Symmetry: C3
Subunit: 90 residues, 3 copies
């Protein structure tokens, strides 16, 4: 499992979410933040190893505008993930 944290332009959020959905990426969490200050959207997406590239690519393509300020995408290691509904791991 990996945890993807992406910072994108609010104006590109809808396009980004559509792209993720298209790529079969459904689980995600997002919040509004400020960055350098300008408003931005932060997405945190927990994915299995096979979905790292597809997720990263969906965002790269949908979030780019070509102008400085487009954002970044971090891929973080995750040691364990638990599903609250079942109380079981993964």
């Amino acid at each position: 499992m990996k945890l993807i944290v992406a910072i994108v332009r609010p104006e590109k959020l809808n396009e980004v979410l559509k792209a993720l959905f298209q790529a079969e990426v459904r689980g995600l969490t997002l919040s509004r933040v400020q960055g350098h200050l300008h408003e931005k959207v932060r997405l945190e997406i927990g994915v299995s190893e096979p979905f790292v590239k597809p997720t990263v690519e969906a965002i790269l393509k949908a979030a780019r505008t070509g102008e400085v300020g487009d954002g970044k995408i971090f891929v973080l290691p995750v040691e364990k993930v638990y599903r609250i509904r079942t109380g079981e791991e993964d």
Copy 2:
């Protein structure tokens, strides 16, 4: 240390916070977020730094308190932390 990131239902937050307090967990950060399991749902994200010996007990407290058994309960991520510092003292841990 590890960093616990839990996404829970808003209606379960008080129960979660009570469970953490009872499990001796005092240090934590939280905020409101939106999530999908276009339909976004309000959720609450908790970020808790906890040392290895106590990761399991802390995760368990959240699991029990946040559960409803219905789809949408959320997930808990446990991330590795290379280093942690206390600002009040600068202490490397």
Copy 3:
């Protein structure tokens, strides 16, 4: 690469941003959160999220520690998280070392 997560007092934000820019740090993300320390109900804090290369880890941490300190309970904490890789959306450039 590393991802620095710092929780600081709102009152210390401007001083922290100042020290960071001075340390040649510029790109970063921040948000308002509610928190509580290890003592004994929640208080507002500012959460900084800073992606940096290995050479900038020590300098970034040093800047926050020096500027965000009041010496009183509630000062916050700094987490240095491992990053597998980072992509710049505009250029598609990837960093890993």
